[PDB]
């Protein structure tokens, strides 16, 4: 699951086999089975295979959730 | 002069001639066969130039020439030095720092020549060992020497493009 | 007959330096491509140009060693 | 007389029904807000600095919650009375009597009492969105980060039952009471832990500024509905 | 340097010049296919708008 | 060394044949992938133009 | 005379440099696979090309050392 | 006759080059083991293949040193 | 004789390599233990296997050095 | 006699320094580029000032070595 | 007669390797201790274990230098 | 006699040191310029003074080598 | 005759090994101090203890160097 | 009489050590200023005091080398 | 005689070791100061404590080298 | 045979015997003094074994080597001890050659550590007698005793891990 | 000398074992058994008391 | 002379180390013994309290 | 005695005296021109002392004298100055001998820097005269003077640190 | 009396002229900035004193 | 070595004392007087402001 969550509510909760995202430290390519880590987003348009405008990125080998506010498809 | 070197240079010129003629023998809308490979290599050099139009022409000619130069060695320093000098002069005319840059260009040409001579020396040592007396090791040596020559040609083209862009 | 020893010493030094440089570069680009798979073409192109730049000097060293051995 | 009291009873009952409908509408958002809070709490607990420790206090801001319109039984009054009592008790100095208001009635009461309003906001819808409060939350958190105050507090009513609107208080002060999660999982940091925490802390603060206000809106709607039902029954028995 | 100059002039001239001339016959055709498709799509959209009117 | 040169040439030819025996498939596959990409790029535009023309004809028929 | 020791030192320095090279190389690719388990074959292929690329020069050095020892 | 000197210095250089390589190899493997224990078999296999690859040139150097000492 | 110097040089090179490798191993084990405080058994077994493989070469080097010194 | 050995050691040390320099340079730049895929041209430019600054001295060293070998 | 310098280089190399190993050991263990104030006795005990592990080859080298000097 | 070898050794050691220093300096400036591009000018300047600082002893070494060769 | 040269270099690498050794010992000390100042005393005890073993091997060499000088 | 050779060797070793030291110091302060532009004056004063501190001893080494060359 | 060469070798090795140690010891200090600027006094205390400990070995080494040169 | 080595071995065995007898002079539910020390060595060795049947063998080996290193304060034996330990580990349950060499290397490392300590102490004592560094001599003896203690612990741990692997 | 030393070491180890280590192990096992018996008695008494109260 | 000098040095070392080592070793041994005794008498007191509670519960039920 | 060294020392003393007289020719609340430079250097040395009052005057004179000595060289004493500084630092309030060794090393390092600069300048001048690199000679004098200045400030900082530690 | 001293003096004169022509401004503006800071502090103190005196006089006049 | 160390130390001490008593005491006294004058001006301004406030009250 690559479900994103906003204070108003969820937006998308589909499954995926590829994740890409631009973070403040740099670009990241996330794959299933990745080590848990934390990285902050900086007004980036995350792409799966939507916009975030400020938020946090957490990864778990099971699933990845991108919590942020003001996110639209 | 060097009669053998002149004959070899003429041989590479003729080889490039027939290769280009065969590549552009027929014109159509869908490049296939040799035309497909020509389109692919043209796209590759165009992308390299964009990363680092007018100069893509002689860039392609130089790439093909060094490819042929690496090619016939499988079966010279003056030529490499002259080519490096001509490339440096063309880059300067297109537009101790200058002396240093010329030294680096000469060093790059000498490095390509040294790779060629390293391959030649390995082949000669293998031939001498055969005369004294390794088909698979000879095959591996020929393969990786041709591979290294191709990468050296690509690196020389990229360095020339970078120097031209800087100038 | 010390020229042979001098040439061998120069060749060995050049080989060690080239090995160190190539190891550093390709080890770093391994992590470079491991962090984000989508950049592989660019990373491999700069990979190859960098290793060629690194190996440039050792070829000159080998040529000088051969000249010294001949002399 | 009879016609007047019948009309008053009718209009009061109708708008009490509207208040109940608004309560029902707000309950959906209150129930749907949880997952963000759960995720941010888990992340903060897993990961854990200027705003993580106390300091020598010199002033304290007092956030309060009220309503744009009145017509409530105790919602806009109990919080004000409790806040005034604790202020007059603790914050003897006017410099430490710093306050922040969010409701029109509270604004009017503090203007009458001649209190030093620092920042204020009014004219908010029945069901607000984030962007309407984000600016105020960012201003308050930036003030706290720069260090104008040294302790933050919120006063409001928490919705526990339709007929019971309990009043309580929280602490937006430097974070001390963090509930450690049972499954403590160790993560890595790409831009390093110092920057990670420095970016996450304002996010947690401006998320904690929520939840409380949703509960306050639900409580005020419940109080409105209950008071208007009581008034309607009183009018009916008087008629 | 005279023989090298002759060879390089030929390489930058004549042969490669004609080769670049023929490679255009494929590259420009490939581009013009998409260009003509886009133009035909625009004409069809105009026809649809005329039908709507 | 005429004999050594001939032996080296024969060994190089054998080496080229052996390398081709394992490298003919990958290079041909790469060329076929490039050709398929170009063909798909052309066919997408052709299909889009045809579909647009058909839609225009249908709209005109509906208008009539 | 000294040609044997010249070849010995040449091969010794070449081997030392190559060892540092592939050690760094394997350490970095192992860190990479630990980072992202899903890229195992591509990381393996990159390390396989890299080790040959770095170790190319020491073989030439060893050949030159053998030639010198013969001389 | 410095053949003994040549063989010994070659062996010493080979061992010195090897050891640092193997250590730097296994260090990152144990780091990955600490980071994510679930991949112990694949990191073990990669470790063993890395050490096997690294400890190749020193072996050839040792045999060459033995040959030189004999000669 | 000169063979004594050769053997001493070989022993010194082997000792330096083994020290570097095993120091790196034990430092990385300390780092891993600090990172995860409940993996001490497996960490220790990996530590011992790593130092064993690292020091494998130095023992053979010392044996060859002793043989050369006797020669 | 000794002049050729002096020249050989000079060029060998110069090659060591040069290679280590630009190898470290290109490795760190690969890491930075993989970190930030954009802004490639500025780093690709700084490549060559860095390499020239590193390699300035060894060319003078090689020239001096050739002069000494002449004597 | 000339085994004095052999013993000298042996002890010097052993001491240098031991020093590097010990420095790495203490650096990493105190870094871990700073990272986590607890488990201090565990860290210290493991660091003494590592020190005893590393100080193995140099002592044997010193003994070998002693017997070589005797010879 | 030995003056040529002395001058070559001095020049080579100076080149080695200068290469190391410049390599580290411009590698870290590339790292910083990749971190934040805004301060590009001040990093370039500071790296100018850094290069000037590091490349001071090798010049004196070259001058002393020339003097010794003259002697 | 050569003993004085042997003894002088015996303390040579020992000083170099000790200096290169404890250099990393104190660099990590300040890192813990910078990360956390409250643990200043406990870090100092470890570093003072650690340097003793770092310089332990050179102490064996210098005394042995004096014996070599006398003989 | 090899005195010039000894002096040149000492000068070269000092130059290499100084080069490494200034490279490390100035690279670290470059990283620091890139990290935080605000502390620039403090970073530069620490830069100069540190570079003077490290370069102090090689000056004494060069003076002693000149004395030895005179003797 | 050889005493001058021995003393110069000892001085050069000690200078290289001291320079490397001082550079490594001081490198992290700029980063620490940039991270927390408030710990400046205690950071200078640990500046001037331990640097003398590192440099103590070079001073004794050069004193012994002067003694050996006096012979 | 080596008369001095035999006498030293007999003295160490007698010392171990009297130490064991004194530790086990009486048994009770409250261990104090020497009994407390025996309890704590037993707990330490049990914890080491658990971290890495043979507990009493390890305790006896630790006591023997501790007494042997302490006696030096005032090679054949080490080789024999290493061979016996390797044989016991094998009987309890290229690459094999390296594994066998490793135990001898550990034994030789312990022997060399004690030999270097003894040689340094003897040289210092002879130099002081001929021409008195009491404080440096005491420091050297304390350092050697500490090094021997760590070496004994390392040898015990190595034997334990080798037995566990076997 | 090696064979005699090994035989003497083996004999001394066996004698020390069978003389004190077996008695020392017996004493340690007795202490552990006493502690375990006390713990088991406490647990049984607590369980019986809880059952009686319930 | 050398033997007697070494013996005197060893005696002086033991005397110097006695004062600096008696306190730490004795403190550690005392702490270990105190922990063991704490475990033992905690178990004994828990057993006695359990027996007393059982007797009290039986009396209360009776 | 060293007549040339004594004459040079007297020359630097006279230069320092006339510089001080020019700097303190007039006193007021507005420092401008030479007074501005004197105020600037006084503020700099005061800030340095605060970072690392009573010894501020001594620092000012030592900095001025060492700057004059560095400037004079453009066209035993160092050991004596270092010994005097060490004695003053000790009297203001193996560690002591180690600190004296570091002070002597710092003095000898400054002396060696000046000596190396002078030797390089003399060799370059002799080479140019015999067979004229005016621009490289000017650059050489430039960075030699610059390095001498940084060495002067470094020595002042080290002396201040030693005095504070004492 | 060799020409080395004269050559060194000429080189020093040329270096001094170049250094003056290339660095007169950087030192001059720094000295002027320090003097301007001192003058600004003095003028601020004087203006504050004058304003305080004027305010006291105005308050006295208003009271009278 | 030499015998000018004592003479150099005596000359340094004499130069220190003479330069101090000739310029350093006057320059330091002038700087202290300027600082004290600035402080006195600030204090006088504060006193004038306090007097103005008292007169207003």
JSON list of C-alpha atoms in Angstrom, two decimals, chain I residues 1-65:
[
{"chain": "I", "resi": 1, "resn": "UNK", "atom": "CA", "xyz": [71.85, -13.51, 6.06]},
{"chain": "I", "resi": 2, "resn": "UNK", "atom": "CA", "xyz": [69.76, -11.66, 3.48]},
{"chain": "I", "resi": 3, "resn": "UNK", "atom": "CA", "xyz": [67.09, -14.34, 3.81]},
{"chain": "I", "resi": 4, "resn": "UNK", "atom": "CA", "xyz": [66.60, -13.27, 7.42]},
{"chain": "I", "resi": 5, "resn": "UNK", "atom": "CA", "xyz": [65.80, -9.74, 6.21]},
{"chain": "I", "resi": 6, "resn": "UNK", "atom": "CA", "xyz": [63.44, -11.16, 3.58]},
{"chain": "I", "resi": 7, "resn": "UNK", "atom": "CA", "xyz": [61.59, -13.25, 6.17]},
{"chain": "I", "resi": 8, "resn": "UNK", "atom": "CA", "xyz": [61.36, -10.29, 8.54]},
{"chain": "I", "resi": 9, "resn": "UNK", "atom": "CA", "xyz": [59.91, -8.09, 5.79]},
{"chain": "I", "resi": 10, "resn": "UNK", "atom": "CA", "xyz": [57.32, -10.75, 4.96]},
{"chain": "I", "resi": 11, "resn": "UNK", "atom": "CA", "xyz": [56.39, -11.17, 8.63]},
{"chain": "I", "resi": 12, "resn": "UNK", "atom": "CA", "xyz": [56.02, -7.42, 9.09]},
{"chain": "I", "resi": 13, "resn": "UNK", "atom": "CA", "xyz": [53.82, -7.02, 6.03]},
{"chain": "I", "resi": 14, "resn": "UNK", "atom": "CA", "xyz": [51.60, -9.91, 7.13]},
{"chain": "I", "resi": 15, "resn": "UNK", "atom": "CA", "xyz": [51.32, -8.56, 10.66]},
{"chain": "I", "resi": 16, "resn": "UNK", "atom": "CA", "xyz": [50.34, -5.11, 9.38]},
{"chain": "I", "resi": 17, "resn": "UNK", "atom": "CA", "xyz": [47.67, -6.54, 7.09]},
{"chain": "I", "resi": 18, "resn": "UNK", "atom": "CA", "xyz": [46.21, -8.82, 9.74]},
{"chain": "I", "resi": 19, "resn": "UNK", "atom": "CA", "xyz": [46.14, -6.03, 12.31]},
{"chain": "I", "resi": 20, "resn": "UNK", "atom": "CA", "xyz": [44.37, -3.64, 9.95]},
{"chain": "I", "resi": 21, "resn": "UNK", "atom": "CA", "xyz": [41.75, -6.19, 8.92]},
{"chain": "I", "resi": 22, "resn": "UNK", "atom": "CA", "xyz": [40.94, -7.54, 12.36]},
{"chain": "I", "resi": 23, "resn": "UNK", "atom": "CA", "xyz": [40.86, -4.07, 13.91]},
{"chain": "I", "resi": 24, "resn": "UNK", "atom": "CA", "xyz": [38.34, -3.01, 11.28]},
{"chain": "I", "resi": 25, "resn": "UNK", "atom": "CA", "xyz": [36.30, -6.15, 12.02]},
{"chain": "I", "resi": 26, "resn": "UNK", "atom": "CA", "xyz": [36.19, -5.62, 15.76]},
{"chain": "I", "resi": 27, "resn": "UNK", "atom": "CA", "xyz": [35.40, -1.91, 15.41]},
{"chain": "I", "resi": 28, "resn": "UNK", "atom": "CA", "xyz": [32.47, -2.73, 13.14]},
{"chain": "I", "resi": 29, "resn": "UNK", "atom": "CA", "xyz": [31.25, -5.35, 15.62]},
{"chain": "I", "resi": 30, "resn": "UNK", "atom": "CA", "xyz": [31.32, -2.70, 18.35]},
{"chain": "I", "resi": 31, "resn": "UNK", "atom": "CA", "xyz": [29.29, -0.41, 16.10]},
{"chain": "I", "resi": 32, "resn": "UNK", "atom": "CA", "xyz": [26.77, -3.17, 15.39]},
{"chain": "I", "resi": 33, "resn": "UNK", "atom": "CA", "xyz": [26.42, -4.04, 19.07]},
{"chain": "I", "resi": 34, "resn": "UNK", "atom": "CA", "xyz": [25.82, -0.36, 19.85]},
{"chain": "I", "resi": 35, "resn": "UNK", "atom": "CA", "xyz": [23.18, -0.18, 17.11]},
{"chain": "I", "resi": 36, "resn": "UNK", "atom": "CA", "xyz": [21.34, -3.37, 18.15]},
{"chain": "I", "resi": 37, "resn": "UNK", "atom": "CA", "xyz": [21.87, -4.41, 21.80]},
{"chain": "I", "resi": 38, "resn": "UNK", "atom": "CA", "xyz": [20.27, -7.87, 21.43]},
{"chain": "I", "resi": 39, "resn": "UNK", "atom": "CA", "xyz": [22.33, -9.43, 18.60]},
{"chain": "I", "resi": 40, "resn": "UNK", "atom": "CA", "xyz": [25.49, -10.15, 20.61]},
{"chain": "I", "resi": 41, "resn": "UNK", "atom": "CA", "xyz": [25.64, -13.95, 19.94]},
{"chain": "I", "resi": 42, "resn": "UNK", "atom": "CA", "xyz": [25.38, -13.80, 16.15]},
{"chain": "I", "resi": 43, "resn": "UNK", "atom": "CA", "xyz": [27.56, -10.69, 16.09]},
{"chain": "I", "resi": 44, "resn": "UNK", "atom": "CA", "xyz": [30.28, -12.51, 18.04]},
{"chain": "I", "resi": 45, "resn": "UNK", "atom": "CA", "xyz": [30.17, -15.60, 15.82]},
{"chain": "I", "resi": 46, "resn": "UNK", "atom": "CA", "xyz": [30.44, -13.38, 12.74]},
{"chain": "I", "resi": 47, "resn": "UNK", "atom": "CA", "xyz": [33.33, -11.54, 14.41]},
{"chain": "I", "resi": 48, "resn": "UNK", "atom": "CA", "xyz": [35.27, -14.73, 15.06]},
{"chain": "I", "resi": 49, "resn": "UNK", "atom": "CA", "xyz": [34.65, -16.13, 11.58]},
{"chain": "I", "resi": 50, "resn": "UNK", "atom": "CA", "xyz": [35.76, -12.83, 10.06]},
{"chain": "I", "resi": 51, "resn": "UNK", "atom": "CA", "xyz": [39.01, -12.66, 12.00]},
{"chain": "I", "resi": 52, "resn": "UNK", "atom": "CA", "xyz": [39.64, -16.32, 11.15]},
{"chain": "I", "resi": 53, "resn": "UNK", "atom": "CA", "xyz": [39.30, -15.74, 7.40]},
{"chain": "I", "resi": 54, "resn": "UNK", "atom": "CA", "xyz": [41.31, -12.51, 7.66]},
{"chain": "I", "resi": 55, "resn": "UNK", "atom": "CA", "xyz": [44.20, -14.13, 9.53]},
{"chain": "I", "resi": 56, "resn": "UNK", "atom": "CA", "xyz": [44.20, -17.26, 7.33]},
{"chain": "I", "resi": 57, "resn": "UNK", "atom": "CA", "xyz": [46.70, -15.62, 4.97]},
{"chain": "I", "resi": 58, "resn": "UNK", "atom": "CA", "xyz": [49.17, -14.42, 7.66]},
{"chain": "I", "resi": 59, "resn": "UNK", "atom": "CA", "xyz": [49.77, -17.95, 8.99]},
{"chain": "I", "resi": 60, "resn": "UNK", "atom": "CA", "xyz": [50.68, -19.24, 5.53]},
{"chain": "I", "resi": 61, "resn": "UNK", "atom": "CA", "xyz": [52.85, -16.17, 5.02]},
{"chain": "I", "resi": 62, "resn": "UNK", "atom": "CA", "xyz": [54.71, -16.84, 8.27]},
{"chain": "I", "resi": 63, "resn": "UNK", "atom": "CA", "xyz": [55.20, -20.50, 7.34]},
{"chain": "I", "resi": 64, "resn": "UNK", "atom": "CA", "xyz": [56.60, -19.54, 3.93]},
{"chain": "I", "resi": 65, "resn": "UNK", "atom": "CA", "xyz": [58.84, -16.93, 5.57]}
]
